[PDB]
Scaffold this active site. Sequence first.
Site, PDB file in Angstrom:
ATOM      1  N   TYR A  27     -44.267 -35.161 -79.136  1.00  0.00           N
ATOM      2  CA  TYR A  27     -44.637 -34.530 -80.468  1.00  0.00           C
ATOM      3  C   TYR A  27     -45.302 -35.659 -81.304  1.00  0.00           C
ATOM      4  CZ  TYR A  27     -41.070 -37.046 -83.140  1.00  0.00           C
ATOM      5  OH  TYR A  27     -40.497 -38.018 -83.647  1.00  0.00           O
ATOM      6  N   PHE A  37     -47.607 -39.412 -89.288  1.00  0.00           N
ATOM      7  CA  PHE A  37     -46.452 -40.073 -89.688  1.00  0.00           C
ATOM      8  C   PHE A  37     -45.628 -40.342 -88.737  1.00  0.00           C
ATOM      9  CE2 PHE A  37     -46.005 -35.871 -90.701  1.00  0.00           C
ATOM     10  CZ  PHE A  37     -44.436 -35.516 -90.023  1.00  0.00           C
ATOM     11  N   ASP A  38     -45.384 -39.691 -87.567  1.00  0.00           N
ATOM     12  CA  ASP A  38     -44.651 -39.951 -86.694  1.00  0.00           C
ATOM     13  C   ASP A  38     -44.933 -39.501 -85.017  1.00  0.00           C
ATOM     14  OD1 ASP A  38     -41.969 -40.878 -85.536  1.00  0.00           O
ATOM     15  OD2 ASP A  38     -40.933 -38.695 -85.706  1.00  0.00           O
ATOM     16  N   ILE A  57     -35.954 -30.585 -88.308  1.00  0.00           N
ATOM     17  CA  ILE A  57     -36.054 -29.752 -89.499  1.00  0.00           C
ATOM     18  C   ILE A  57     -36.220 -28.047 -89.135  1.00  0.00           C
ATOM     19  CG2 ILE A  57     -37.558 -30.918 -90.873  1.00  0.00           C
ATOM     20  CD1 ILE A  57     -40.094 -30.195 -89.655  1.00  0.00           C
ATOM     21  N   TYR A  83     -39.286 -31.065 -95.266  1.00  0.00           N
ATOM     22  CA  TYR A  83     -38.699 -32.019 -96.087  1.00  0.00           C
ATOM     23  C   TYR A  83     -38.617 -31.580 -97.770  1.00  0.00           C
ATOM     24  CZ  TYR A  83     -38.724 -34.664 -92.104  1.00  0.00           C
ATOM     25  OH  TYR A  83     -38.628 -35.084 -90.671  1.00  0.00           O
ATOM     26  N   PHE A 100     -47.276 -30.447 -86.529  1.00  0.00           N
ATOM     27  CA  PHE A 100     -46.780 -30.847 -85.445  1.00  0.00           C
ATOM     28  C   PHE A 100     -47.719 -30.488 -84.324  1.00  0.00           C
ATOM     29  CE2 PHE A 100     -43.213 -33.451 -87.068  1.00  0.00           C
ATOM     30  CZ  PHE A 100     -42.803 -32.645 -88.353  1.00  0.00           C
TER      31      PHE A 100
END
EC number: 5.2.1.8
Length: 108
Positions: A27, A37-38, A57, A83, A100
């Site tokens: 991902y 961010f990830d 999530i 979030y 994502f």
Amino acid sequence: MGVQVETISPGDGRTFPKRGQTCVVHYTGMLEDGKKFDSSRDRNKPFKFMLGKQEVIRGWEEGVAQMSVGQRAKLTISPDYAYGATGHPGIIPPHATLVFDVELLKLE
């Protein structure tokens, strides 16, 4: 809103994650502006989570369950499914819609 799923490349169209199964994914997570961010790909290690255990999530729980094995898809996740108002200090800002890029490699 909840989670929107937009296909990127098709999977087998037949095998969908069920509750209790382990989802093995690569991902990339980005803010709505596009900032990453990830990413599991940058670590070169797939990410594993067990569906229904709230290890991810809500948008992942409901979004990945809609994907077939081998599919790559774009999940757009509203903050309530993400979030929320709080977010994550210094990573995800308040009330953030997340995007994502998710590939479901296999189920375990």
